[PDB]
Design a protein around this ligand. Structure first.
Ligand code: HEM
Length: 152
């Protein structure tokens, strides 16, 4: 559980991401692929992407990055009341994609990194801790939904 004041920092931050979803989107994913390349394997559509530059130029990637932030965003504004929203993601990752929780951790890290790089002044320790929590609550919820479906 997050305190109200924590939710706010999370949401205070999200507002900045929301000003350039696509842009936050690509940095996030490129960082992820870059830092944990094995994650690139889940994506048949992106595996032919050999460099940053080509990653950046990919429209599919960029679209995919908006889809991600968009979805994450709906969850964060639910402030912990996200079952409905969460359910479909646990399902597809348990059943179609098989995304391990670890892959979720990685991603959480890229998020953090991208926010800290782009919004230093709005992402100090306090807000950062708050974002970490929020991300943790998401991963914990999903993990439980995964087990309930037979995955993990
Ligand atoms: C912040 C956490 C994430 C969110 C909100 C998120 C959201 C989504 C959404 C909305 C889709 C499209 C619908 C669906 O297939 O479920 C998607 C698709 C997918 N996600 Fe994720 N995702 C996250 C993390 C990841 C991670 C870490 C991976 C793999 C390392 C991943 C792999 C996939 C794949 C393979 C698909 C299929 C999309 C396509 O190719 O059409 N997702 N993700």
């Amino acid at each position: 559980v997050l305190s109200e004041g924590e939710w706010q920092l999370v949401l205070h931050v999200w507002a900045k991401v929301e000003a350039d979803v696509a842009g936050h989107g690509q940095d996030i994913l490129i960082r992820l692929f870059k830092s944990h390349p094995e994650t690139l394997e889940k994506f048949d559509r992106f595996k032919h992407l050999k460099t940053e530059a080509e990653m950046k130029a990919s429209e599919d990637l960029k679209k995919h990055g908006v889809t991600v932030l968009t979805a994450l965003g709906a969850i964060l504004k639910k402030k912990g009341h996200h079952e409905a929203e969460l359910k479909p993601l646990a399902q597809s990752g348990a059943t179609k994609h098989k995304i391990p929780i670890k892959y979720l951790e990685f991603i959480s890290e890229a998020i953090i990194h991208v926010l800290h790089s782009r919004h230093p002044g709005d992402f100090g320790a306090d807000a950062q801790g708050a974002m970490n929590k929020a991300l943790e609550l998401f991963r914990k919820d999903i993990a439980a939904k995964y087990k309930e479906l037979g995955y993990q």
